[PDB]
């Protein structure tokens, strides 16, 4: 009964942009479609960075700026070509890492 299915994945630094993008990318899945799996959470990987405060010495004082990387997955049992043609247009967001695979 198992069959290959399209499984779009999203990635972004900001999360509000990411789950707004998730809602926008599943909303097209809902119309002219069926089932529509929700956006399941992924572990997310941050990158820490310690940098010196002073231009010269005083290495004892520093600061940690870091960049987290969120990830998400979305699925749909029915390929439904009409919402795939609808999928081609995406006004938002400029900052998103959608990836399509079947």
């Amino acid at each position: 009964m198992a069959k290959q299915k399209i499984r779009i994945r999203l990635k972004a630094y900001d999360h509000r942009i990411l789950d707004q993008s998730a809602e926008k990318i599943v909303e097209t899945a809902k119309r002219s479609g069926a089932s529509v799996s929700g956006p399941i959470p992924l572990p997310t990987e941050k990158s820490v960075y310690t940098i010196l405060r002073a231009v010269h010495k005083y290495k004892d004082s520093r600061e940690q700026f870091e960049m987290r990387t969120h990830k998400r997955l979305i699925d749909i049992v029915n390929p439904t070509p009409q919402t795939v043609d609808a999928l081609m247009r995406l006004d938002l967001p400029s900052g998103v890492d959608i990836e399509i695979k079947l």
């Binding site: 972004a12 967001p93 900052g95 998103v96």
Partner: protein, 210 residues
Amino acid sequence: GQKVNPVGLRIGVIRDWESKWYAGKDYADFLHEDLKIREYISKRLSDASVSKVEIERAANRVNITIHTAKPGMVIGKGGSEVEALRKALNSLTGKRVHINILEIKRADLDAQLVADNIARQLENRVSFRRAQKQQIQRTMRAGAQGVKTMVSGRLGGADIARSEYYSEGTVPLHTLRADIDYATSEADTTYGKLGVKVWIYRGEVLPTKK
């Protein structure tokens, strides 16, 4: 410190980054092209002026929207100027471009503009004290819960060095919802450069839910 920049704290919790995008195979190259766009907008800062440019990119696309107190300076007559700028940027970025424009209401309220203006006043060799007073009066005309301002380096050419600051109303940088605008500027008198700083407390932001 002794004074950490509020702009380095406000971002994230209460304000958006000046340039948002995603990366990507080349995180550096997007940053290079964007910093270059800052380098040319800085050339546009010479007279046309700008408070800030917001930037967005999505693979072979860019959204370098501008907001400025004087919108017609960059549009020109017939809109030819924004087009020529669009070509000048298209020649460099190597990708499609469509620069946007915005006209801020009560533009004096913005920290960048008042800081650039008082800096130009320092270029005009007007007394720095009276200039800061006119700053506080003008921002008072702008209407705000609290405002602070500061200048450093040579002042009137007197003494080896001096620093001054004036303020009125609450200016709570330690507040995490303060939404305080921050600005810096660099005057260039023959006696020497003049450091410029200004803090603008727009007021607390109340979180929403649906």
